[PDB]
Amino acid sequence: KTSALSLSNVAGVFYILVGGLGLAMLVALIEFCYKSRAEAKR
Amino acid sequence: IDFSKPFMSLGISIMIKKPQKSKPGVFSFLDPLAYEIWMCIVFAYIGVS
Numbered sequence: 515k516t517s518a519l520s521l522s523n524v525a526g527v528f529y530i531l532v533g534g535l536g537l538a539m540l541v542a543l544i545e546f547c548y549k550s551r552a553e554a555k556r
Numbered sequence: 557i558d559f560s561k562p563f564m565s566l567g568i569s570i571m572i573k574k575p576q577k578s579k580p581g582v583f584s585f586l587d588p589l590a591y592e593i594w595m596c597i598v599f600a601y602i603g604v605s
């Protein structure tokens with residue numbers, strides 16, 4: 515019959531999304547650690 | 557006995573139990589996605605923002 519989508523059938527796109535958000539925060543923090551350390555020298 | 561001309565047409569038929577089917581309500585445009593996907597979309601929307 516005509517079945518409705520379940521979270522199992524789409525959870526894959528949910529793991530990439532959360533992975534992207536974690537990666538984006540990591541990228542932002544790394545640029546923060548670089549500028550913060552550089553500012554101390556200057 | 558001696559019957560009379562058919563005053564009504566019958567015929568064997570197979571009765572069963574009626575497989576009741578849900579009746580789409582007003583909020584039936586949400587049927588394609590299970591409510592657990594809609595719940596997670598809201599959480600994803602909050603998390604992404």
Ligand SMILES: CCCCCCCCCCCCCCCC(=O)O
Binds near residue numbers: 534
């Ligand atoms: C842009 C960043 C993307 C990050 C994507 C992370 C996804 C991780 C999902 C792991 C699921 C478990 C392993 C399954 C592997 C497989 O089935 O081949």
Ligand SMILES: CCCCCCCCCCCCCCCC(=O)O
Binds near residue numbers: 543546547548550551
């Ligand atoms: C999975 C959870 C991870 C939690 C990460 C906590 C740390 C986030 C960054 C805090 C500031 C780090 C940089 C401080 C200044 C510096 O040393 O350059």
Ligand SMILES: *C(=O)CCCCCCCCCCCCCCC
Binds near residue numbers: 535536537
């Ligand atoms: C400067 O270099 C700071 C480095 C900080 C590293 C830690 C940042 C982690 C950010 C990603 C967290 C993702 C969590 C996902 C759920 C567990």
